[PDB]
Amino acid sequence: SDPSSINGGIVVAMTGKDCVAIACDLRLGSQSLGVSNKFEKIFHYGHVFLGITGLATDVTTLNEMFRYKTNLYKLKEERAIEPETFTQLVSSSLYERRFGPYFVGPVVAGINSKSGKPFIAGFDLIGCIDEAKDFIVSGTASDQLFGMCESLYEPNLEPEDLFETISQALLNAADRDALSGWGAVVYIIKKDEVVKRYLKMRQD
Amino acid sequence: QFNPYGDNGGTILGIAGEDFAVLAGDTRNITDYSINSRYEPKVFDCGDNIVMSANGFAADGDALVKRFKNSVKWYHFDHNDKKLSINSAARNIQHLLYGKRFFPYYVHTIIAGLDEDGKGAVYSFDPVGSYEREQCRAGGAAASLIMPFLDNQVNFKNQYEPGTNGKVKKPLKYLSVEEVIKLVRDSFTSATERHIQVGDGLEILIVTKDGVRKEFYELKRD
Amino acid sequence: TMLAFRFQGGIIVAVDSRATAGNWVASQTVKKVIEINPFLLGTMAGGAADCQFWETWLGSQCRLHELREKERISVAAASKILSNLVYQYKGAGLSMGTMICGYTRKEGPTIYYVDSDGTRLKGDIFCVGSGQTFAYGVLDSNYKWDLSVEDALYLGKRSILAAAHRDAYSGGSVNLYHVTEDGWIYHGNHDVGELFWKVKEEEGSFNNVIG
Amino acid sequence: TIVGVKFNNGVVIAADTRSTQGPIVADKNCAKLHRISPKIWCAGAGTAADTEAVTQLIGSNIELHSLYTSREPRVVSALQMLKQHLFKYQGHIGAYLIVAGVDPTGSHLFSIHAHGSTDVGYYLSLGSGSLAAMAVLESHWKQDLTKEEAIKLASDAIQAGIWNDLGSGSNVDVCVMEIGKDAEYLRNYLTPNVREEKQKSYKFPRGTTAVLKESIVNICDIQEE
Amino acid sequence: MDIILGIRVQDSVILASSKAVTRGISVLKDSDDKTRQLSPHTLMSFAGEAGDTVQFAEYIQANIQLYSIREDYELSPQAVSSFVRQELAKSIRSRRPYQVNVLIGGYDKKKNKPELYQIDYLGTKVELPYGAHGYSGFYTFSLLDHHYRPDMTTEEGLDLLKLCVQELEKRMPMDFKGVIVKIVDKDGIRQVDDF
Amino acid sequence: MDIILGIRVQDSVILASSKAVTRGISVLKDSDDKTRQLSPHTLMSFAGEAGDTVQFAEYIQANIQLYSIREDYELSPQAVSSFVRQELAKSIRSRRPYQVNVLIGGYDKKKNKPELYQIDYLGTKVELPYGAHGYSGFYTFSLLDHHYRPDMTTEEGLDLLKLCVQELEKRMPMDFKGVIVKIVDKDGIRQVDDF
Amino acid sequence: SIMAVTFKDGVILGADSRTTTGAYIANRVTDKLTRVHDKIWCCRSGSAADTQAIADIVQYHLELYTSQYGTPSTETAASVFKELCYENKDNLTAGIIVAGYDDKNKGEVYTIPLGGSVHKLPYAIAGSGSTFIYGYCDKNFRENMSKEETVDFIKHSLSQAIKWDGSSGGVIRMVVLTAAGVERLIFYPDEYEQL
Amino acid sequence: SIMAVTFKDGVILGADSRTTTGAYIANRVTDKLTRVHDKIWCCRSGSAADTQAIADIVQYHLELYTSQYGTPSTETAASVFKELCYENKDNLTAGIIVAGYDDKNKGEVYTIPLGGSVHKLPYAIAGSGSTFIYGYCDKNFRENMSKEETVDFIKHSLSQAIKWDGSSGGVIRMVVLTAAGVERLIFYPDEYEQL
Amino acid sequence: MTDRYSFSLTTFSPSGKLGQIDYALTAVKQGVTSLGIKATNGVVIATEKKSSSPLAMSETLSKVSLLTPDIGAVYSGMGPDYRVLVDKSRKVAHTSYKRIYGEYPPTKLLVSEVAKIMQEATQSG
Amino acid sequence: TQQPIVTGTSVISMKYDNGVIIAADNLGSYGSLLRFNGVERLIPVGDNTVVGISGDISDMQHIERLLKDLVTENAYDNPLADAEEALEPSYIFEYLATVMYQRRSKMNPLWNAIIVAGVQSNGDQFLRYVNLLGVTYSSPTLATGFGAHMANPLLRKVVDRESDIPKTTVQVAEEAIVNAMRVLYYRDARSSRNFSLAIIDKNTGLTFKKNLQVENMKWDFAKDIKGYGTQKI
Ligand SMILES: [Cl-]
Ligand SMILES: [Cl-]
Ligand SMILES: [Mg+2]
Ligand SMILES: [Mg+2]
Ligand SMILES: [Mg+2]
Ligand SMILES: [Mg+2]
């Protein structure tokens, strides 16, 4: 009934030293029934990464929508969109559906190509921007993620250390949620290289 | 319509060591968005080296604790001052809770102490009496924030040994009382940051063969 | 998810370990098998408290029976004490799904499904819980009367695993019991997080998942 | 908790920095002080997306209006544009605002509710911590306050909310708008809720997490040659 | 309607769909084909609310056939599935949404690969090795999770499908009057007349 | 439970009762005997809410068996049916009524006549040549109205019963997993093991 | 608690200053006496948003009226209020008293309750607290009172309304409309409570 | 509209005579001034059945009190009313004013609103029509009035209450309680309407 | 009433010329001189304030206009046409950009939007 | 289950160095009607306890009688009724707290919020709260209803924690209480200007002040407020 918890899933993002990390589980279900263990929730448009939790049809729809908009942005502007600008675009796009919203919990992550400054941001289903320094959480196990991140996180972590922190934050939070898990992916992002790692986790 | 239940917030945490046990809980008491008290003790010494906390609706929690303390008193009278073992106390509490199965004590109960072999013990209850011995258990408002952290940092879940890459798990080495208290404090500091009903103060009751000791720590008051 | 089936070597009982409150995983270490006596087992599904309380109570009634009658209680009589009890509380809101499994001389290996609606059914195979359908698939396609205690134990273990994977409200670990002419025998706690990858590699199953 | 306090030669507004989804804190350092125009600022309570969106829209139209009229914008213009917009949406746009600013007419202080009703005052408060704040304002406010006294009163009213209201917390943001001066935005004017050092470091040993696959992600465009 | 299954093997996609059409307390028909050929190498099965199912299927069919004629070219299964998803995603926020769940089984002639897509009425698309809609998956996914291997032969796929239908016939309360099975491969679409 | 049928022929009463026990989405059993022998020449089939059905049947059984021992005499089917009706008529105005419908098939040894009584949970009794509870009658009464003659043999009764079960298997949505058939005549009660 | 009273030299409007959200006094120094024209004012009761929106629209209409046709009558102003209140009665909660001074017609008072109807009266009372002073006001009102008498009448009347009605309180604001001009009066608790 | 007022020589009870079923006046000459003891009377408002049943029970209690302990106080009578109204608050709708005359205590008035609480006062007003005369009664009441002044105060007060409240009307009944005895007064519409 | 001119008033002549555009350029030619120069660290735009009367206050007439905080405009030709273009240019900078991306448009894209408005007046009815 | 009819608003209280202060206005509201203007909602028990009650007044009057009866009953066969075996605040509270929770458990509550303020035999300050749900808590400052939202913040500025109690004098505490009562009169739509205040000191005993009024109110600034935005006249 509650659209935000039919399919289930989670996303978490963190900042480190000259790097950002964004991660998500791979589960897609119909309430109790697990349907797919390859439903990725992180997408990217150039060097800007977007994670989306919530109702899966809207996750897919928005991805297609932001691909549409960022492709036109690039043709006209003759440059790739930046995280700060994309964040405003996501907010604008969501609020235009104020009284008929997409049931999602987006999370933007990336590094500004000009300033080199790491950037993360979260939103509610209708566009409110949460621009945190430390971390952003989203999904059915957001409470769990808040508790993991708030205790595990420390500022200025190196890429390979940040990987361990965000991976353990996601994994242990998902294991306390019935509608999350079934695999996980972690993106480690630096100014001009991105590494994608699939995590080994319990499949129940 | 009259609603006989309420939510007084708070959060509690029990951790069983090798030869000790702790039962912690914040001292904040609330209704809705108001603070009732910044220091309202929630974890109690019930005698016989048993500590108890009934988190949730404080009126039902105070009633239950009061009735269990009473049960300990009468257990001494009826059975020649015999010590009530933690396992026996747990079963007794199941019957207290299930006695009100159709008008429940709206509380998440936890007790802590030592078993009959001297090892640390924590028992966890749902509102209607189902119980289970556990090594680790958080209860109340911010339980969802704390338990995952404890799965990771107490039972070393999802943690493996470097170099093996997922093949060999991190070994389950025992934790000292000083190590547990660090995890308890960090749990409540983190919970206080992200949960509005958690804060003000942290009171920890530590149980050993020597008896029951108390420790208090300040928490953020916002 | 919990199952129990009769076969050549007695009864196999297998259960999961998960307990939830909504989407919140409350526990992964729950004991859903109740050792009523050396010959009787009780499985627990539905309300945790209802099942726990009334099945340990059942053990008190079974003990009182064999004190008064100087004879082990039958599986039929034991199951009916529980079913008659929950029937008195019908409408009040008890939530229980249970299999009463045991062996006696007069009956042999026997399984009764007992329900908070008052339903009491004797049978060879039962699967109960939110993930019962997943377990039924594996069981029905691989069940035979002529199974070895070793193979039967694995089938029960594998049928829970199947449900632990697909059913969101099932998982944690698998508890195995084997009931014979000489009583029940515990066959360990099996973590699903390790069992899944083990079964995937040896069986060659769960190819849809990547590992 | 958001407040507004008039003084001798201008007006000051203030706010806490807590955002909540139920009993959870979504953001610990939220910015509730919005800029409508250079010398017209408003604080917002209620639905976060609404206070932001409605402020930006009116701020945009105010800027265009200022360019059209070759005049500096007035607080009554922002007030009128906000209330008519909110009224039209019958309270469904959950924006509860305290609008303040200086303009050629003088210094002004108004409140706005979601249904479109406006109020005038020398001191105002809104939000879940408005009762804690108003208690402080009613106890300590007086006529002919100085700038230094008004900032103090304003931040004390926010603190009352921070401590006593669970819906409010963290830091105090302030903005001072004085006549014949630039408006000074004091982000995190007070920081009375810094987290204490943790007992332990939870930095993991590298290789602690189990990995299945690794791969480089192509973020660059299609290459030449 | 009730049960629709799909399984993608080595060189083909197999769709199984129940034959029953129950309208209340009566089984009206026991030979109903719950599928439409969208293109020579693309088949779509469907199940949901009465009327909406066929209306939607034939609407999609017409659109794809129109595309085929205009471009003198067959769309890839992936392209067809994306078109279908968008229609359902559009539909869910309409005045009266299409209450239809579909499986799209196609053979991509360019990549020489079978492809199975599961899409629900909300517009939730997933590519799978095997899929189902409604209560079918609850019984069948455990069997498939067990006996399926990606290099299976069409005959092995049919045997595994028989195992699924047998389990459904044993444990499901509703009599769905057997299934019509159809295979989609490089040579096109054909029906298994004995199952 | 689901389908229970009864037919009174020349020299016997035949009761047919479904074997399925479905709990929600799954069929937990396919060999359930929905009947109790009240006395050597009296059989009662039953269907209704779970738990209540068996609890009621066994309660009635016990009462009749108690009567038999006390008087060293078997009550007539008419007397047993009246006792059962009164219990249900008492039950309907209770705090929690028995939600059970029954058929009572008996052979009166005094009158040398078979007798079939249909009683619903309200305590509504009717003596009939053939009867049913639930949705069964909707399909079967038309066949029985047509092919029923009062001088039929037991074998002809079974053939007519097969025609009823075949129609139910064709048109009913639920798979009731066949029926257990039992015959009640002068020699007592016996089960037809092949049907 | 609001009222408007005609007298010899013109008309006086009176009101309390309390705005409440339930039992919380959101504003204790509210101005419920609002100006739609130089010498046509109104008293507002009910929804603060609705009554403000209405008054703003009326002020706009009368400003535009004045630019074309010169100073409007008080009757005209009441008609504009009525038109808004009547035509939007389903969506509004506004109880307004219109009062104005012409030189030709002198002091006039029109009351517009919830329905949107118009009633011309010598004096009018409205708001939640008006209920408590129907008896007092009826007994103490006289036509052609002096300015000082009318001020005392309103002061005493609203004092009682404030005393008994929790929704009313704060200061008593008054606005005097005569040929002489527009005079604003204010009376504080210490003054009117001891009456 | 009911009220009781203490004065120099004792106390006077006053009431209207209207009983309504919705907007229909079921009785236009009702007697709401009822006697529970020689010089202890009450004013009844709310349910006519509830207030009669209560008054009858009280009269019984005070008759039995008198037989054992002599004449009861007005405070005692109010306590008996309170005990019934408080303990049966869920099932009652009664607003009663108790008034009586002792020689020791002189005239006393107790009001018992819906909750069952007791309030001793110099004078009391109650009933639907009391709302309209809170302002008037507060302004015009004085302690130690004469009999004639108190009659005029009640007459004028209830006149206004009747004027504005549709639930009130008919005649104004009054009962005077003094050392001299018990005097009944009545005032008709033609008399009190012109006030 | 109704605008019944739903057809183009600018059309191709046999020679391929768009007359109204050519004539518009002729009007621009008659207009007062304005210029623009780009430096390494800035840009300058300039024009003559051709006052129509010495009694007129030429400060009230702004030939050079701010479009965004970082973009300015100047013209040659018909002043009233320029004035309305500036109004539309200022608004389109908000509606088609700032309200979407939360920042002011880059020069080339704002120019593109202005250009679009002028093209439409060359083809619309 | 019922609904409250005639009601009493905020009861506010705080501890200070030598005792406790409690206060409550003298109003009995009947919905929005300020019906009864002479209601005492502070009820002393002996010379060492004052019980402040808000909510339903008929239930308050019932509780008042229970307390009166409690004193009577304690005197029975008690030669030390005015000495060592006199009623303590802690005894009176626990009694009420038992009754409140019993009544809520029978789904027939006493619709009140109660604060028991007093001084114990050993001179310790007693201040504890109980309500219709049987919920209990203690704090250096306690308030009911609106007082919880507006009074507590002001009183907590004086005594923010336990260590501030010995530093707080009776003059400072009374001043804070009286100021809080004024604020509630400004902002609570169900408050009255008239109120009662009680001090229970371990040295000077029980001082019960009646017929107090809210004074030194600020209203003058109201004259400058015109319209709701644009209006100038
Ligand atoms: Cl207003
Ligand atoms: Cl009557
Ligand atoms: Mg699972
Ligand atoms: Mg706070
Ligand atoms: Mg019948
Ligand atoms: Mg009348």
Curated annotation (Swiss-Prot), chain A:
InterPro entries per UniProt: Ntn_hydrolases_N, Proteasome_beta_3, Proteasome_bsu_CS, Proteasome_sua/b, Proteasome_suB-type
GO BP, sorted A to Z: proteasomal ubiquitin-independent protein catabolic process; proteasome-mediated ubiquitin-dependent protein catabolic process
Alphabetical UniProt keywords: Cytoplasm, Isopeptide bond, Nucleus, Phosphoprotein, Proteasome, Ubl conjugation
Phosphoserine carried by residues: 30
Superkingdom as given in the UniProt entry: Eukaryota
Principal cellular location given in the protein's record: cytoplasm
Family the UniProt entry places it in: Belongs to the peptidase T1B family.
Species of the source: Saccharomyces cerevisiae (strain ATCC 204508 / S288c) (Baker's yeast)
Job description of the protein: Non-catalytic component of the proteasome which degrades poly-ubiquitinated proteins in the cytoplasm and in the nucleus. It is essential for the regulated turnover of proteins and for the removal of misfolded proteins. The proteasome is a multicatalytic proteinase complex that is characterized by its ability to cleave peptides with Arg, Phe, Tyr, Leu, and Glu adjacent to the leaving group at neutral or slightly basic pH. It has an ATP-dependent proteolytic activity. This subunit may participate in the trypsin-like activity of the enzyme complex.
Protein's name in the database: Proteasome subunit beta type-3
Cross-link (Glycyl lysine isopeptide (Lys-Gly) (interchain with G-Cter in ubiquitin)): 69
Claim: Transmembrane helix is one of the keywords in the record: no
Location(s), subcellular: Cytoplasm; Nucleus
Listed GO CC annotations: cytosol; nucleus; proteasome complex; proteasome core complex, beta-subunit complex
MF annotations from Gene Ontology: endopeptidase activator activity
UniProtKB/Swiss-Prot annotation, chain D:
Role, per record: The proteasome degrades poly-ubiquitinated proteins in the cytoplasm and in the nucleus. It is essential for the regulated turnover of proteins and for the removal of misfolded proteins. The proteasome is a multicatalytic proteinase complex that is characterized by its ability to cleave peptides with Arg, Phe, Tyr, Leu, and Glu adjacent to the leaving group at neutral or slightly basic pH. It has an ATP-dependent proteolytic activity.
Gene name as annotated: PUP1
Record EC number: 3.4.25.1
Keyword Cytoplasm: yes
GO cellular component: cytosol; nucleus; proteasome complex; proteasome core complex, beta-subunit complex; proteasome storage granule
Record key words, sorted: Cytoplasm, Hydrolase, Nucleus, Protease, Proteasome, Threonine protease, Zymogen
Family: Belongs to the peptidase T1B family.
Single Gene Ontology BP annotation: proteasome-mediated ubiquitin-dependent protein catabolic process
Compartment(s): Cytoplasm; Nucleus
Domain of life: Eukaryota
Pfam families, per the entry: Pr_beta_C, Proteasome
InterPro entries attached to this UniProt entry: Ntn_hydrolases_N (IPR029055), Pept_T1A_subB (IPR000243), Proteasome_bsu_C (IPR024689), Proteasome_bsu_CS (IPR016050), Proteasome_sua/b (IPR001353), Proteasome_suB-type (IPR023333)
Name the record gives this protein: Proteasome subunit beta type-2
Catalytically driven reaction(s): Cleavage of peptide bonds with very broad specificity
Note: Present with 11400 molecules/cell in log phase SD medium.
Molecular function terms, GO-annotated: endopeptidase activity; threonine-type endopeptidase activity
From Swiss-Prot, chains G, H:
Enzyme Commission number(s): 3.4.25.1
Pfam families associated with the record: Proteasome
Keyword match Cytoplasm: yes
Organism of provenance: Saccharomyces cerevisiae (strain ATCC 204508 / S288c)
GO molecular-function term, one example from the UniProt record: threonine-type endopeptidase activity
Main function: The proteasome degrades poly-ubiquitinated proteins in the cytoplasm and in the nucleus. It is essential for the regulated turnover of proteins and for the removal of misfolded proteins. The proteasome is a multicatalytic proteinase complex that is characterized by its ability to cleave peptides with Arg, Phe, Tyr, Leu, and Glu adjacent to the leaving group at neutral or slightly basic pH. It has an ATP-dependent proteolytic activity. PRE3 and PRE4 are necessary for the peptidyl-glutamyl-peptide-hydrolyzing activity.
Gene Ontology BP terms: proteasomal ubiquitin-independent protein catabolic process; proteasome-mediated ubiquitin-dependent protein catabolic process
Gene3D superfamilies, per the entry: Glutamine Phosphoribosylpyrophosphate, subunit 1, domain 1
Additional remark text: Present with 7250 molecules/cell in log phase SD medium.
Domain of life of the organism encoding this protein: Eukaryota
Reaction(s) the record says it catalyses: Cleavage of peptide bonds with very broad specificity
Keyword Protease: yes
Subcellular location as annotated: Cytoplasm; Nucleus
Keyword terms: Acetylation, Cytoplasm, Hydrolase, Nucleus, Protease, Proteasome, Threonine protease, Zymogen
Family per record: Belongs to the peptidase T1B family.
Identification of the protein by name: Proteasome subunit beta type-1
Assigned GO CC terms: cytosol; nucleus; proteasome complex; proteasome core complex, beta-subunit complex; proteasome storage granule
Curated annotation (Swiss-Prot), chain I:
A GO biological process held by the record: proteasomal ubiquitin-independent protein catabolic process
Keywords: Cytoplasm, Isopeptide bond, Nucleus, Proteasome, Ubl conjugation
Gene Ontology CC annotations of this record: nucleus; proteasome complex; proteasome core complex, alpha-subunit complex; proteasome storage granule
Annotated crosslink Glycyl lysine isopeptide (Lys-Gly) (interchain with G-Cter in ubiquitin) location: 108
Subcellular location, record wording: Cytoplasm; Nucleus
Main function: The proteasome degrades poly-ubiquitinated proteins in the cytoplasm and in the nucleus. It is essential for the regulated turnover of proteins and for the removal of misfolded proteins. The proteasome is a multicatalytic proteinase complex that is characterized by its ability to cleave peptides with Arg, Phe, Tyr, Leu, and Glu adjacent to the leaving group at neutral or slightly basic pH. It has an ATP-dependent proteolytic activity.
Additional comment: Present with 7060 molecules/cell in log phase SD medium.
Quaternary structure (record): The 26S proteasome consists of a 20S proteasome core and two 19S regulatory subunits. The 20S proteasome core is composed of 28 subunits that are arranged in four stacked rings, resulting in a barrel-shaped structure. The two end rings are each formed by seven alpha subunits, and the two central rings are each formed by seven beta subunits. The catalytic chamber with the active sites is on the inside of the barrel.
Homology family: Belongs to the peptidase T1A family.
Identification of the protein by name: Proteasome subunit alpha type-2
Residue window of the full protein shown: 1 to 125 of 250
